Amino acid sequence: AVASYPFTTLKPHVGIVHYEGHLQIAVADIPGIIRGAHQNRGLGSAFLRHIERCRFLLFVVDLSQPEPWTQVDDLKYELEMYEKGLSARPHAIVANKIDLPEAQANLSQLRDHLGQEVIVLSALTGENLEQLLLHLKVLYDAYAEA
């Protein structure tokens, strides 16, 4: 369920991604997390229990906010608050909603702060989705094997 109002998808949602080698990679969607969350502010960090089993993380960051680079800093801080190794756990950073001109404006400073390694995407228009799939597969083949 997707909607404009915040704090949707309360229940964790699993979808799998198909590939050519008859292998499936499962991706999980949990409700939104907030800075703090250690004092049970917002929806808390109760839903974070799923992520323990998850081999790697997708840091989904919206470019609508004036400073999206601070987003990942808040995320890593809260994950540490839950469990120490989660911050050190390997991941990929993904930017969303780049169809908006303000996102395109702030893209330059994202490149300045976060770097080239971060993959930039649109969900509504499905921009640069393929690079995400490449990166998903590569991370799987990296440290999800043996």
Binding site: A1, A3, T8, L10, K11, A46, R49
Partner: peptide
Amino acid sequence: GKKLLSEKKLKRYFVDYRRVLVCGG
């Protein structure tokens, strides 16, 4: 046979945590 469209608040049904006291026969 059709699946029923779900409410946003489906956390009512889905449970992740439970305290159980088990007793044998």
